[PDB]
Design an enzyme around this catalytic site. Structure first.
Site, short mmCIF file in Angstrom:
data_model
loop_
_atom_site.label_atom_id
_atom_site.label_comp_id
_atom_site.label_asym_id
_atom_site.label_seq_id
_atom_site.Cartn_x
_atom_site.Cartn_y
_atom_site.Cartn_z
CB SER A 156 0.54 5.48 -5.34
OG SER A 156 -0.40 5.32 -6.38
N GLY A 157 2.35 7.99 -6.24
CA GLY A 157 2.91 8.92 -7.20
C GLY A 157 3.20 10.29 -6.64
N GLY A 216 -4.78 6.24 -4.05
CA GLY A 216 -4.93 7.54 -4.67
C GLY A 216 -3.84 8.52 -4.33
CG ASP A 251 6.20 2.47 -8.26
OD1 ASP A 251 5.90 2.82 -9.41
OD2 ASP A 251 5.36 2.38 -7.34
CG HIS A 267 3.06 0.07 -9.68
ND1 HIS A 267 2.69 -1.11 -10.28
CD2 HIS A 267 4.11 -0.23 -8.87
CE1 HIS A 267 3.48 -2.09 -9.86
NE2 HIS A 267 4.35 -1.58 -9.00
N1 LIG Z 1 -0.50 2.71 2.77
C1 LIG Z 1 0.54 2.63 1.71
C2 LIG Z 1 1.35 3.96 1.57
O1 LIG Z 1 0.76 4.76 0.51
C3 LIG Z 1 0.05 3.85 -0.24
C4 LIG Z 1 -0.45 4.15 -1.50
C5 LIG Z 1 -1.14 3.14 -2.18
C6 LIG Z 1 -1.73 3.37 -3.56
O2 LIG Z 1 -2.33 4.42 -3.76
N2 LIG Z 1 -1.61 2.43 -4.54
C7 LIG Z 1 -0.87 1.19 -4.40
C8 LIG Z 1 -0.39 1.12 -5.87
C9 LIG Z 1 0.24 -0.26 -6.11
C10 LIG Z 1 1.62 -0.37 -6.29
C11 LIG Z 1 2.23 -1.61 -6.50
C12 LIG Z 1 1.46 -2.77 -6.51
C13 LIG Z 1 0.08 -2.68 -6.32
C14 LIG Z 1 -0.53 -1.43 -6.11
C15 LIG Z 1 -1.69 1.45 -6.63
C16 LIG Z 1 -2.22 2.66 -5.83
C17 LIG Z 1 -3.73 2.60 -5.69
O3 LIG Z 1 -4.24 1.70 -5.04
N3 LIG Z 1 -4.39 3.59 -6.31
C18 LIG Z 1 -5.78 3.82 -6.39
C19 LIG Z 1 -6.68 2.84 -5.94
C20 LIG Z 1 -8.06 3.04 -6.01
C21 LIG Z 1 -8.54 4.23 -6.55
C22 LIG Z 1 -7.63 5.19 -6.99
CL1 LIG Z 1 -8.16 6.68 -7.67
C23 LIG Z 1 -6.26 5.00 -6.93
C24 LIG Z 1 -1.35 1.90 -1.56
C25 LIG Z 1 -0.84 1.60 -0.29
C26 LIG Z 1 -0.14 2.61 0.35
#
Ligand SMILES: N[C@@H]1COc2cc(C(=O)N3C[C@@H](c4ccccc4)C[C@H]3C(=O)Nc3cccc(Cl)c3)ccc21
Ligand SMILES: *SC[C@H](NC(=O)CC[C@H](N)C(=O)O)C(=O)NCC(=O)O
Length: 237
Positions: free
Chosen positions: A188-189, A186, A93, A44
């Site tokens: 994720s990955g 932020g 993913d 993603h």
């Molecule tokens: N609490 C749970 C466990 O860890 C998580 C991680 C995420 C996460 O970081 N993201 C969900 C991911 C996503 C995956 C699939 C579908 C839709 C979104 C996109 C990414 C994300 O928002 N990045 C981001 C957003 C704003 C600024 C910046 Cl710099 C980066 C979200 C929810 C959780």
């Protein structure tokens, strides 16, 4: 990371920051160094326009505010997204990044172990998630790499919390019934790592969840053990 604390140098030497430089430069995702020339992250992270020569991968960095124009970074040679990945879904993913040059290993820049063949997830009792993501749902990227201890959740329990989605065998969940500690935007990955026989193992890739640190809404991670055949095939061993 919500509810975590500051990491120290050398604690998570596989953690990398995936950043995009347009006119400004911003951290977008975590990743894990798995070899000299290979990073593992979430597919993603690449959902945006596939712009060339914009990604910068920072390794050996603890504090994003310590990054200057003189700070070294890696560039992308190739992105390998899993063939069954779909943008509108959470399945598969996972993405491999081949770097343009191999990185040499140091105390602050070295690979996480991939999970060993024939290890059930119930062997992992001491797991941690790390990153520079938000420290609250409507938060901001954090400067010092955060860490938080988090328990693995059964796939049956995780599915009960997300009945609108299919939690597959290729996913692993982690979180607290009462919330409060979780990965967030932020993160994720990046890695979910669990320490076994004195070595940290990459058990999950931070993927998705509803909100951050909410009660009975655990984080969902790509289960790395269920992608080992794919990782080995794509890295040509
Ligand atoms: N609490 C749970 C466990 O860890 C998580 C991680 C995420 C996460 O970081 N993201 C969900 C991911 C996503 C995956 C699939 C579908 C839709 C979104 C996109 C990414 C994300 O928002 N990045 C981001 C957003 C704003 C600024 C910046 Cl710099 C980066 C979200 C929810 C959780
Ligand atoms: S499994 C990947 C990392 N190990 C090595 O790279 C081997 C280190 C030594 N050469 C050795 O022990 O033989 C690793 O362990 N990463 C996870 C960690 O806990 O450091």
């Amino acid at each position: 990371i919500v509810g975590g604390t500051n990491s120290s140098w050398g604690e998570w030497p596989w953690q990398v920051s995936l950043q995009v430089k347009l006119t400004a430069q911003r951290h977008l995702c975590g990743g894990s160094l798995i070899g000299h020339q290979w990073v593992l992250t979430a597919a993603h992270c690449f959902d945006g326009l596939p712009l060339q020569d914009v990604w910068r991968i920072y390794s050996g960095i603890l504090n994003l505010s310590d990054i200057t124009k003189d700070t070294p970074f890696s560039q992308i040679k190739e992105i390998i997204i899993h063939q069954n990945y779909k943008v509108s879904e959470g399945n598969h993913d996972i993405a491999l990044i081949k770097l343009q040059a191999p990185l040499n290993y140091t105390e602050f820049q070295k690979p996480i172990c991939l999970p060993s063949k024939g290890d059930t997830s119930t062997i992992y009792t001491n797991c941690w998630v790390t990153g520079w993501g938000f420290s609250k749902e409507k938060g901001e990227i954090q400067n010092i790499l955060q860490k938080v201890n988090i328990p693995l959740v059964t796939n049956e329990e995780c599915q009960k919390r997300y009945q609108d989605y299919k939690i597959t065998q290729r996913m692993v969940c982690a979180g607290y019934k009462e919330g409060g500690k979780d990965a967030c935007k932020g993160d994720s990955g990046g890695p979910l790592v669990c320490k076994h026989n004195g070595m940290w193992r990459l058990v999950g890739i931070t993927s998705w969840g509803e909100g951050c640190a909410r009660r009975e809404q655990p984080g969902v991670y790509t289960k790395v053990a269920e992608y080992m055949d794919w990782i080995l095939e794509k890295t040509q061993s």
